[PDB]
Design a protein around this ligand. Sequence first.
Ligand SMILES: CNC(=O)C1CCN(C(=O)c2oc(S(=O)(=O)Nc3ccc(Cl)c4c(Cl)c[nH]c34)cc2C)CC1
Lengths: 57, 331, 786
Amino acid sequence: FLKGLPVYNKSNFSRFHARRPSVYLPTREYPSEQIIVTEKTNILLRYLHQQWDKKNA
Amino acid sequence: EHVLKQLERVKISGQLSPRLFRKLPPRVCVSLKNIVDEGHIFLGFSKCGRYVLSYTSSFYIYHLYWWEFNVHSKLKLVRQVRLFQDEEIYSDLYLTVCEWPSDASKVIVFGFNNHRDIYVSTVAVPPPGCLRHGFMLHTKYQVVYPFPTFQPAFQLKKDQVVLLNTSYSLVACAVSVHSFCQILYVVTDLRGRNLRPMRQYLTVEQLTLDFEYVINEVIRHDATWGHQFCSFSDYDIVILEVCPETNQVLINIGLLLLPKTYHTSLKVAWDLNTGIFETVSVGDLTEVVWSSYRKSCVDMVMKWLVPESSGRYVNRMTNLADSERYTWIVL
Amino acid sequence: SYNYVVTAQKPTAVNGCVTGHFTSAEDLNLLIAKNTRLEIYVVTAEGLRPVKEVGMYGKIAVMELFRPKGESKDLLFILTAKYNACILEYKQSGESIDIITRAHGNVQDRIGRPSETGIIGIIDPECRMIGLRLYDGLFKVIPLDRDNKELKAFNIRLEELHVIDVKFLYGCQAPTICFVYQDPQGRHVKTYEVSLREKEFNKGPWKQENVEAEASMVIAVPEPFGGAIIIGQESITYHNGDKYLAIAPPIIKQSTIVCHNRVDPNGSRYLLGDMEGRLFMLLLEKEEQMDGTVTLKDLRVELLGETSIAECLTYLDNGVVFVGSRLGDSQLVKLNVDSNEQGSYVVAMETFTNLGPIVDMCVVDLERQGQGQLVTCSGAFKEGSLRIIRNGKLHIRTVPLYESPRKICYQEVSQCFGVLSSRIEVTALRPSASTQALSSSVSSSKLEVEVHNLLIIDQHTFEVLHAHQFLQNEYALSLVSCKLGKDPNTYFIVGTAMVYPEEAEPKQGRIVVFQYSDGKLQTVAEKEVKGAVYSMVEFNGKLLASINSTVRLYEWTTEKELRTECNHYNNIMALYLKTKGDFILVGDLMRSVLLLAYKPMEGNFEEIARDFNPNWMSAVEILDDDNFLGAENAFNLFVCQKDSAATTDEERQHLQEVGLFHLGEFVNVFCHGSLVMQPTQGSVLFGTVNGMIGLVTSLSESWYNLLLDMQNRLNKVIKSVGKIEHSFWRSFHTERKTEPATGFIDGDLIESFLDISRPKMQEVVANLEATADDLIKVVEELTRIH
Ligand SMILES: CNC(=O)C1CCN(C(=O)c2oc(S(=O)(=O)Nc3ccc(Cl)c4c(Cl)c[nH]c34)cc2C)CC1
């Protein structure tokens, strides 16, 4: 179990021995870059439609 | 692993669900000896677990009653209905009641007695405690000798629409009290309060589909063998899956179209919102039978079955145990 | 009735655990979800430093950090318990903190059964898509293409129907998922190659292989090793292509592994946490293949040491690892290259106070002056402690017990806190407060294994004066201290039950009355009862002890023995008892709540009213003679009031729910009291499993209407991270149905007022005139209660 553990910053935690964060309440808002929408169509219907479309071609 | 350990584990975990309690035996039982009517035939507990259904079937009258239930106290009836009005029944008959997945304002009872007839009537449930509007519709549809399949789960999967397959159509009657569902874009009588008023106010859509017309249109406008096999002899239609999210239904249709007789299958997706829309989704071939089609359809639906939450499901009772509340009544 | 919910102490139990460069591309950050309290930290030379703490309108269930191509810093995908998936980014302009939502939208299906193991969320290593497991048989997949304006999530049927853990493998041309599901034969491992163009699964590589019976989690090793590691009780197996490695060391056998983390970026070292707070380092040994690649020759595990019971580990730079604890205080333990003389490679550095599961509590005023402080029972197994939560920010005195505390009830005559607790014995694993005491006694009744014992704690210094041990195989269920009948003294009544492996339900119990004389506790009398005494409460001087599915009233006779008076068998499981005056409130486990009454004229129980709705109650409190509050397993609060206005026998015996609220936490106990020095008429304290402590206060009709209007106006002027509507967040939600919250004013939202900008405050009351000073005054008055 020897150790050569990673060091991302050689100085981090070097002065440990020589308070909850302030709450964030936003007043302004920017338009959402995108929207997430679930697919309501039944997967069985999608499967059968795909099969029929493949057959038609 | 005992029940006390489960409670201790819940107190800290914060996760308490009925599933984790399945292992333990029932919590409350009943002898059903003293707490019984007198010729009642109990049908089972309610979805809410607050009533117990039953009927008598004394021509036949076929009364049905509710039964408020208590662990130790005797059952107290709440309601009494006819459920078969103006119908002189000269057959034994078979009753099976089932409630809607989400809506809990009514239940649908079915009757099963060369051509057959079926009695289906909805009955409003007692008010929890408007409190005045309670109704019960009646209707009869006769089926052809090749009697159609019967499957409550998909028939009542819609929140307020029940799909009736009459062997010539797939009428889907929707009833609400209070704005459109059938074409939002079978004769039914009115009852309730021992009166038959003219139809807050109730509603009846009764949107129909023509099987013969749909099949004729599909074969005319599809199918590889459009140059042969004109017309058909008989067919059977079974519902594969109903999609309340977008109001669509899947139906599997088998035919026996013909000096060349062969059996063929088909499928169509009917969209409730836009009425009669036979959007074909499969075309089979005629080969040199009904039971085989039923077996194939049941296997196909089973293969694609997705489990549904215990919150929504079409409970079916016919003739007791309440799994959710771990209640049991022994006959 | 109209009530007002406010949070006295925010939740302190860690639920989510992630690390990554979020605030900026050049600073390490540590994010902790807790319960609906997301906190952002940054690693610095002095140590972890707070940055911001956004309160999401939902229970954080999934947190993942991912950096799609062409992004300077990582994004944050968050899915609430109410299915509110939304990707967030942290953009700061100078000294202004801003957290925009990349994307947002509900992902609830409404036609699926929630999975037994809970919500699982993963993201492709290449960020090609986001995988969600929410229901049995369905695996929602969200494409991440940032070209169009819509993210069309689509479900793919899962034939397994019993999947437990799902992970995205590494170094595959196409996004594949490796998961462990369960079948009647046993558990198995299977792989699917997900396709977004075809929206269907594909036959994955290294076809399914059977796995151990207790396989519980899957870890996706990165390159150059690749493959997956399945961790199960007394079994660790690594599967990759033809190669298959397994190891079952003895050390792991003691306890199960519940959490994992990756130390080396190449996956050469992992940290595993056990239920007993053991820290294991998992090693992968590689060899130089003929071609010149890495093959993971062998596997091996080591015991680093012991830490607080972990729900998560997250390794930080310089060897220090943060231990996210749910049943105890979190830690910042650091690993040491050289072992300790005792044989521990891990030494703690800092401890974060965690109120943990608030199993039971009771306010006391031992300091006089009409000032009360909360005494609770935190911790689960070895973090069990009593937290003396006073009021200053709250100063908390943690008294470690090293054993699970069950109940607590303070007795004033002897000035001692009678407390139930249970340890685990094989004999004694570790020294516990029970093991060492000034005096100790063991039950002498003639009527691993857990030992239960009702031990008393001093009120001043909290040294355990005496530790009474119960009969073997006997469980301590409920505890009460009160005066009975005509006796001048006070007894310590404790309800206990007997457990045997043969039976799955209790069949024998005990009701023992204790008296703490001088420095010893003796048994004056005892009663044997068929069943388990779930709960007990003094009722008009009679012990209203509840047995399994029954309730009883006991009279303390002159012979100093308990004699039953009347019973009420119409119950499924009577687990909660709250009494006001001559009224009784029985909170059934699966039968919502019922109200009873005792008639002195007839001396018999007469059921009066009952709530017919189906609910799984966790605690019940009687706010007043009419309004009865209750909390259910779905993390919602509801108050039902007895209705006498309607002149109907059926209506009279009907309890209508006139209040609904989605608290968002599992409430364990209610107790009457307040923390402030002795508009709202009464206050009720409740403790949750997440350690949150809140107040519920009644409001007059006019004040409730005013506050409801103020909150509705405020919703417009306050933006929510993730774009989640407050009405939807607080709307009562459960599997059966979901309805908007009514009769409950979210005090947390109201308190936000008087903290928003002055123009915002004016816009809230722009046309109400009330100006702004009046609103500030009323908000400060409401705040002063807690
Ligand atoms: C007669 N075979 C059975 O009963 C088997 C197979 C069907 N089954 C289900 O799992 C199930 O049934 C429904 S249903 O719509 O209420 N009934 C129903 C649906 C579909 C078909 Cl194809 C048929 C046929 Cl054919 C007769 N009944 C059908 C819903 C579900 C989840 C019960 C066990």
